[PDB]
Subunit: 268 residues, 3 copies
């Protein structure tokens, strides 16, 4: 049995996506999650929805409690976690409104805890050095790509996301530099969310939605405008993808993730 | 009416630049500024001078309260902020003693608050994502460039400043890497000073003074020696530029900056 | 007279390397060192051994008290500090099991104090801007290189170490990016250890041991396995190098390091 956690990004966190909804506030050894967990279903699959920035969007990227968010979903029984995120495009072919099923990342964050094993919590003892060669779940990404195709949506099969600290946008010199590094899209929330999911042994995948071309003219109003016009795409993709995930086998995949996570910890 | 704030860098903060001086200690919601504000005039223009590292240079770059400094100047009524900064040259044509009117930056800092909107101060509520495509005021930069020309000074019309955390200087491998990224000069204080000025709706410009060629032989004694020999240039440039700024129209420019700052904030 | 401090890395910290051993716990103005100092000798040379991650390896790279470790060694009278470190290879010619006598570094750390002069300790007052053009002691590196040759070991004469924050390993996009920057090997502990040693006026050198090819397949088990198989090399290199260092003159070298450190401090 699978249980899908869903973390909604800026203007991509509509609770009406689930049927038979029930609100539930929880606590974790790492503090409180961004907001209440919303329990429900999509067809016959159990899901858990969470707004990354809170229902009223009051939390900046640097202040999101990524540890609490991932821990709460893991504690609720989530085997998979599929998220949505607004991002800027660093490539001509990635047009605003396009979806990108990212497969790699480049870290540019500075003030964020990236591990549960900080030597100050009973629940996670020791030192953890988690592998990051393949940060996103290939099987989940494969289903997302095929589903976008069946839906006729403009979608890119791969892409490298550079995550900046924020909250400011990048300068033009930074924008051009990121392109030479191999980055394709840019945001402020992929890291450490993807890292902590891996430590928890969860299959993590991300639906990135391009909202602008950065500055290589971006502004809050421009970002919000593009999201309003295209949010239906991410909603349709999730509704159609989820039942598909719940109809296939994940025993072997989840076992391997559990092993990788367990054997990355160094005990005294 | 305009009021020019002036933030003086290492060995480039002489108070005798203003006439009719008056010392004034202030406080801000973000703490105390580096030192007392010095109120005075240059011809008929009102100015406010502030020493970035304190009068006795006792504050390292990482510890400067950039938030308090910018907030205090904004509170005093400053419409413009022109600063001075010592820097290393990463380009053969930028010789020690040369002035560079920078137009871009690359952030390499790690432990610095870059926004007033940290969700813990009544005066700045919400989440702010300020645009950084054009970090420095083009009109102010234009006047600085033309004035340097009238003064016959060696001056570069543009340049990208890479700001490192410090307090240590860069390694040789880092120095060469910065050059491949497109950086032209290097310092430890441009970021987040330029970012916070933008959030405040202030016209910000920077007078960078090359003091060495980094290491692609730099030392504290070498830096201080070059500054002593060339400080008169920055002083002459400011004295001649300021009356020029006070004789032109800034209503439309200040209005646009105010709009950009206001529309970058996301409210609950 | 010389006194060699030795900081042992992951699986490269065997105390049996010294004769006439005596355990000694100390304290510093910056807190407690990773573990007790082990006083002893190699032939006729006085040495001080310290385990970077503690005897039971319970401290992650981000949490190591680099300030306390370097301060404690300096306080004990150490003139030299030679360390061991496990690392990943970013170059085909650097094979797992090979030794690399590094000569440069690229900083990718974010949450680490890199100076003793933080303006909050009586023992180190003022602002220090230490030069980093040549981070490692050339004379000590020369002896290590010649000794490895006499021992017939596969050893590289130079190399650039990129130090990441950790504790996670790098993504594949990051791995490829580091190669384009000029990095040859990768670890999580060189910075700020090398920086603080320079501030203390100590001759610092590093014996890097390649344990894998990063991901341009790395895992904790793979790293530990390679170290177990090759640890004897680092031990033999240290035992043979140390008596050689104790037989040559260091007065002029130590004097120059002391001058560089003293003249990098800015007093009120
Ligand atoms: C609300 S505008 C910025 C927010 O949307 C995302 N974003 C959209 N476009 C960009 C961009 N060009 N650069 C960085 N983040 C972006 C970021 O993750 C942040 O949470
Ligand atoms: C006092 S020497 C270092 C100081 O001067 C500036 N500086 C001058 N040359 C350099 C350089 N090569 N690299 C970094 N900062 C430099 C920095 O902003 C710091 O405040
Ligand atoms: C125990 S595996 C990671 C530890 O060994 C070193 N290390 C070995 N291989 C690598 C690698 N590929 N990337 C980063 N650190 C590495 C790091 O400094 C850390 O303390």
């Amino acid at each position: 049995a699978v249980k899908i956690g869903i973390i909604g990004g800026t203007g991509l966190d509509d609770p009406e996506i689930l049927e038979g909804r029930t609100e539930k506030y929880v606590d974790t050894p790492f503090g409180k999650p961004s907001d209440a967990l919303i329990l429900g279903k999509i067809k016959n699959v159990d899901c858990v929805l969470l707004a990354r920035h809170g229902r009223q969007h009051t939390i900046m990227p640097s202040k999101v409690n990524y540890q609490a968010n991932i821990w709460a979903l893991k504690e609720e029984g989530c085997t998979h976690v599929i998220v949505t995120t607004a991002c800027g495009s660093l490539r001509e072919e990635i047009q605003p409104g396009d979806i990108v099923i990212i497969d790699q990342f480049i870290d540019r964050t500075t003030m964020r805890p990236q591990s549960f094993y900080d030597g100050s919590h009973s629940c996670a003892r020791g030192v953890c050095h988690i592998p990051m060669a393949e940060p996103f779940c290939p099987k989940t990404r494969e289903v997302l790509i095929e589903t976008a195709k069946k839906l006729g949506l403009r979608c890119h099969s791969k892409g490298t996301m550079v995550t900046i600290e924020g909250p400011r946008f990048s300068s033009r010199a930074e924008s051009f530099m990121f392109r030479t590094w191999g980055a394709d899209v840019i945001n402020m929330t992929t890291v450490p969310e993807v890292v902590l999911a891996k430590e928890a042994g969860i299959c993590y995948a991300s639906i990135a939605m391009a909202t602008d071309y950065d500055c290589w003219a971006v502004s809050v109003d421009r970002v919000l405008k593009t999201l309003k016009e295209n949010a239906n795409k991410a909603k349709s993709l999730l509704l159609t993808t989820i039942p598909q995930i719940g109809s296939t086998e994940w025993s072997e995949t989840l076992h391997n993730l559990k092993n990788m996570a367990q054997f990355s910890v160094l005990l005294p």
